[PDB]
Amino acid sequence: SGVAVSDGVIKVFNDMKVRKSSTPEEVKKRKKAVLFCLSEDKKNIILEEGKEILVGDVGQTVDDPYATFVKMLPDKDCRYALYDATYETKESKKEDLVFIFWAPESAPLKSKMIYASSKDAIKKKLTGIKHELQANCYEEVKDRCTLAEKLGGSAVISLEGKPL
Amino acid sequence: TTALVCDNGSGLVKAGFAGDDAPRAVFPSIVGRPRSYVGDEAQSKILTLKYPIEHGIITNWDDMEKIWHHTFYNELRVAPEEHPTLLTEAPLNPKANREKMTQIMFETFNVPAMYVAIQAVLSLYASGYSVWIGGSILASLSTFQQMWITKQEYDEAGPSIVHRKC
Amino acid sequence: RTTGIVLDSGDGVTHNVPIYEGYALPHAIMRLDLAGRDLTDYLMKILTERGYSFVTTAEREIVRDIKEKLCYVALDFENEMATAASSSSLEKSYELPDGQVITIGNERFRCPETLFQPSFIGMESAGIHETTYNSIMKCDIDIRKDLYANNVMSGGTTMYPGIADRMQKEITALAPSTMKIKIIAPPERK
Amino acid sequence: TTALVCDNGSGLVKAGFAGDDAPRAVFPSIVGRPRSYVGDEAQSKILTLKYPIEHGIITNWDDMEKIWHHTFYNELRVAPEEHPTLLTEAPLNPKANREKMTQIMFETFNVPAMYVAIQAVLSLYASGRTTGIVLDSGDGVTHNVPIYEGYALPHAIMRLDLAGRDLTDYLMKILTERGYSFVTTAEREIVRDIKEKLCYVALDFENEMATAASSSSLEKSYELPDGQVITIGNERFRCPETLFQPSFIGMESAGIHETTYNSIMKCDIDIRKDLYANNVMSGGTTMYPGIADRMQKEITALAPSTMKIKIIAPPERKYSVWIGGSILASLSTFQQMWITKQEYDEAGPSIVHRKC
Amino acid sequence: RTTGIVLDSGDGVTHNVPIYEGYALPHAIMRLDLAGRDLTDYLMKILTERGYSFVTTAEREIVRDIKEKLCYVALDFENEMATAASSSSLEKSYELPDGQVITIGNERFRCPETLFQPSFIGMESAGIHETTYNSIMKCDIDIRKDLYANNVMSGGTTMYPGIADRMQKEITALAPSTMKIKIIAPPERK
Amino acid sequence: TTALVCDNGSGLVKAGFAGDDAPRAVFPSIVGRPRSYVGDEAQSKILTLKYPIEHGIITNWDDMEKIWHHTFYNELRVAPEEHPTLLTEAPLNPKANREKMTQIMFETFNVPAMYVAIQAVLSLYASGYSVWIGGSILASLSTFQQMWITKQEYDEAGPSIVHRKC
Ligand SMILES: Nc1ncnc2c1ncn2[C@@H]1O[C@H](COP(=O)(O)OP(=O)(O)O)[C@@H](O)[C@H]1O
Ligand SMILES: Nc1ncnc2c1ncn2[C@@H]1O[C@H](COP(=O)(O)OP(=O)(O)O)[C@@H](O)[C@H]1O
Ligand SMILES: Nc1ncnc2c1ncn2[C@@H]1O[C@H](COP(=O)(O)OP(=O)(O)O)[C@@H](O)[C@H]1O
Ligand SMILES: [Mg+2]
Ligand SMILES: [Mg+2]
Ligand SMILES: [Mg+2]
DSSP: OOOEEOHHHHHHHHHHHSBOOOOTTTGGGOEEEEOBEEOSSSOEEEOOSSSEEETTTBTTTBSOTTHHHHTTSOTTSOEEEEEEEOEEESSOBOOEEEEEEEOOTTSOHHHHHHHHHTHHHHHTTSTTOOEEEEEOSHHHHHOSHHHHHHHTTTSEEEETTEEO | OOOEEEEEOSSBEEEEESSOSSOSBOOBOOEEEEOOOBTHHHHHOOEEEEOSBSSSSBSOSHHHHHHHHHHHHTSSOBOTTTSOEEEEEOSSOOHHHHHHHHHHHHHTSOOSEEEEEEHHHHHHHHTOOHHHHHHHHHHTOSGGGGOOEEHHHHHHHGGGHHHHHO | OOOEEEEEEOSSOEEEEEEOSSOBOGGGOEEEOOSHHHHHHHHHHHHGGGTOOOOSHHHHHHHHHHHHHHOOOOSOHHHHHHHHHSOSSSOEEEEOTTSOEEEEOTHHHHSGGGGTOTTTTTOOSOOHHHHHHHHHHHSOTTTHHHHHTOEEEESGGGGSTTHHHHHHHHHHHHSOSSSOOOOOOOTTOO | OOOEEEEOOSSEEEEEETTOSSOSEEEEOOEEEEOOEETHHHHHOOEEOOOTTTTSSOOOHHHHHHHHHHIIIIISOSOGGGSOEEEEEOSSOOHHHHHHHHHHHHHTSOOSEEEEEEHHHHHHHTTTOSSEEEEEEOSSOEEEEEEETTEEOTTSOEEESOSHHHHHHHHHHHHTTTTOOOOSHHHHHHHHHHHHHHOOOOSOHHHHHHHHHHOSTTOEEEEOTTSOEEEEOTHHHHTGGGGTOGGGTTOOSOOHHHHHHHHHTTSOSSSHHHHHTOEEEESGGGGSTTHHHHHHHHHHHHSOSSSOOOEEOOTTOSSHHHHHHHHHHTOTTOTTTSEEHHHHHHHGGGHHHHHO | OOOEEEEEEOSSOEEEEEEOSSOBOGGGOEEEOOSHHHHHHHHHHHHGGGTOOOOSHHHHHHHHHHHHHHOOOOSOHHHHHHHHHSOSSSOEEEEOTTSOEEEEOTHHHHSGGGGTOTTTTTOOSOOHHHHHHHHHHHSOTTTHHHHHTOEEEESGGGGSTTHHHHHHHHHHHHSOSSSOOOOOOOTTOO | OOOEEEEEOSSBEEEEESSOSSOSBOOBOOEEEEOOOBTHHHHHOOEEEEOSBSSSSBSOSHHHHHHHHHHHHTSSOOOTTTSOEEEEEOSSOOHHHHHHHHHHHHHTSOOSEEEEEEHHHHHHHHTOOHHHHHHHHHHTOSGGGGOOEEHHHHHHHGGGHHHHHO
8 A cells, every 4th residue: 555645635525526605706616627646755645736627617628528538647657537427317417426547558567556556545535436437448448438337337328418 | 595405215315406307316325334335335345234214214313414424525515504405204204203304404514494395295296206306396496495494493492393394 | 286195105115195185184194115125125036936046235236127127017917927827928138237148027027016915025015006095095085086086106116117007907996986096107206 | 674575486486675677586496305405406406396385375384484594595695684575475375374474474584574465466456457357377376366446355266276387297298299208307497498488378279280280380499408409399389278278187177268257257246347357367377478369269258248358468477476566565655564573572473464 | 843943954055934833934935045065165165274175076075074074063153263273172183085184173163154154155145043033033923932932953054063052042142032042953854 | 555755955866765764865966977977976977067956946857857767767776657756846936847847757757646845844744854754754644645646637737737736
């Protein structure tokens, strides 16, 4: 295991999971999808301010929240993710968050072992999360059908405001 | 502004905001100790599942308030202090269950207002998840917005305001 | 509407309360502990006779989905059994998550019959078609004319194909002939 | 400061320092005695070879102390009492053995801090995965360990006595059919080198044998240490074929392609989908070129047609179990997770069960 | 006799059916797939930790005879483990057909414990001491007094030395104190 | 005169005459094809053993009737045409299994009479191999000798007499 989580990531998770009554001007800077990284010393899980996605921009500059999110993951390193999905089922309309464990084969072993052995140190601190998505290849995470297959299986008819 | 409607059923917990068609949060209402885990994480995982609600009465209270805290924070990611909550129950229900419901909602979460309706009456409203549909179509009504029991009304009345109001 | 008895049957409890033009009758509130979970348990118990053992809780959800998307209630039990006995015209296959396929026969309409014949899982309670009639017969004699023609159904257990027709037939079999029976079956009663 | 990683292999003990790319000390696990030379010395010398780790479980504890003493002094060339040593154990290991290992390590060498990890979870983490069945085909045994989010299911762990040792024995048996008589322990090393350098798993055994019986381009040429050049024909694919057809050796147990399917079908029904597409191979025996394609073909023949089978084979799967432990022990945040001698003095040998 | 629940556990299946004064209760028939074959498999799996590998079917019969004539059920698991941990006072040797001798320790009472703790072979089912209590609790409330004092055991798996005492102790641990528990252990129950 | 009682269990086949204490024929119920052999010869001998009976239902019928012919001829050295046979089964059993049992016993062996009892009821009889003890103590009873289904009763009824009789 080893690596633990910092206070900023826990604060961001508590901010994203539990939303409250907010003003229409502030509600547009909420966090939609944020990744997690390691510092220089590889001892804390820190979010990078560079790569991120806001809730405000979704549907505007970012035509597709998921489509613009696949290319945001670096293919030469291991990364965490937290995607807020809005999928439509035959039964009803749900809005859940997804934990994506990005781990390509092109990354070095030093970045794969650290992120694989410390996954229980981050997932345990993220209380209330259900949808877990472990993705190693890039083609499997690039496809749109896999998210509906993991979320609800064949029941999900539409994903992110558009049908499958 | 919006109101929460929480159909705390015996097998499923349909929880969602008001004014929408479908409940966003649906999961079995069981807690599992390692032989806690609530809902879908319990369904996926070595546990000993058990239902806190029998035939309508809530048998155990710690796991019930745990499920409430779960569906409020880890499932909807909202605080109860802002939006009023709407609870449902079956008729011919022991008054102790409703009293404990009101006490838990007003003391642990400190909601601004709430109400305890009947599942069948709401399922009839939906006729023009039926209970949740009726609760959601009921919470948007303007005439109903006046009969929520509020904390300021609850202080002097104690946990007995629910019988005289609802 | 405000008038009519409600047949609410979810996953753990089935209860009926007749409600008139705003005043409900609490003395006629019937409660039956037979619901979808008991139906799933009965389906698991009767599916072992075909060679498919479901013991664990995780598996039981597969049986739950099988009951949700492959089970129906017959118009009558006897003739549907006669059709089940003769030919496989009734059997239908299912795609399991593991890859295997199963062939269920009379179990498609035998496990939903428990709603009307509780003697399958061992309960002594009258089926959902008799508890409603007994509660209406316990109600007032002037509101029976309005309660007979208004049987509002709700819950996920009332989503079987053909449960409305059987409920109708059973109630007009129990109720007098001159009275007309109506079973409101809304498409969003889940 | 630096941590040691002594992998208790069934036929090769891998030892080195944390942070390196590969183990430094690699020697066969044998304790020679005349009718006590341990490890590499036994092969050079009239002795009866003994294996204390023959089948993945330490059945001869008396020689394990000598094995570890040799590994620490004559192989790693470092003092054990001044460097923490991480150890790996085979799956389905009893609690008594897990306690005896740490008790010996703490009482004989007096190492300040140690840690015991499972080979299966380490090999799975070394492939960038946390959920998936790993194929640990070593020198003495072949284990099929299905793991779920880093927790191996002990009830579905299949153990197979077919491994590289039986493959070397079958190669020695089939090489005498041409005229090459390798009977002694010295020629056994040459047979092992031939198996490592010239053997390969065929995609279709029956079809490959048809071409090998007619074509002459498949025959290779090996150079003996004494200068002789021996030619090997259809024995290149017949030797590793035993892993899929154990009738060649004589055991009734199914091949490594069917034990995997039998172990996957023993776990939960909802996690079988993540096990078919996460089959990881490890051990030195899985280093044959073309074994992943044969495994995928056999599983797709066995598994249902609807679900897909993805077989990933890293090029460093031979020492992946050691590389994983080395990277885990070289962590800058792992120095507080070791089992120091004080905690051992407080809690007895049972501390390893709570800590690990 | 005609009254009492039956604990029938053979080589492949363990099932319990409570039977009153001639009328049995089919709705309380419990079935457990844990039996002697599973115990033999668990013994084979746990005997490899001592250095004895039994892989083939022919050998497995030797393990079956070893379990038949060397295995017993403990009064309680914890104290017997404490005695197993300390000293060899518990170990006993066996004469193999090939001539070798083996020394089994805690395996004499660990593999029969699977009957009460199915989590060893991986099953999620409640042990044989809990399925009987759950079936009696599913039975009628007036026949429980007669079913508690009549637990008829049968089959070859119920022939371990001390299984009757542990079954008793477990049932009076589960059943109320005022009720008296009796475990009929006939000498020809095989 | 004497009656045969055959406890065709899932793991063992206890077969013997009526009126005696112990079953004379006991062997595992498996058939082995060379990689047939039934019972102890299969246990001694390169085969691929498999059980024709799953959890009570008979999966394969050819090997089941083969085991029946074996335990009748090569183990007891008696013909089924003379002594009536008694079969056992578990409750909540598919009717197809009992129908095929009756059809095989009446068509292939042509028994004068037979009966399909319940294993647990017989094991209770033994209380005053328990299933076999109860079957053997049951077959000697005079009152039971009248309710055997006979071939003359079986002809017009077909293989459906067993459900209405037993
Ligand atoms: N399409 C369907 N057909 C038949 N049964 C269904 C269907 N969908 C759901 N069910 C059953 O209904 C149950 C859900 O009941 P529900 O209405 O959610 O109860 P509650 O309102 O108390 O949560 C499930 O257990 C399932 O077995
Ligand atoms: N490149 C290779 N090709 C074929 N076989 C190999 C190769 N490398 C190693 N082996 C075999 O692997 C065996 C060593 O396995 P080992 O690393 O001891 O497994 P474990 O670590 O699980 O005990 C040797 O007997 C050798 O025959
Ligand atoms: N003396 C004994 N002690 C413990 N177990 C025994 C003994 N004798 C037999 N057994 C177990 O009982 C099993 C036999 O079960 P049995 O009663 O024949 O089942 P069935 O009645 O279904 O044939 C054997 O597999 C064996 O493991
Ligand atoms: Mg409901
Ligand atoms: Mg290894
Ligand atoms: Mg038996």
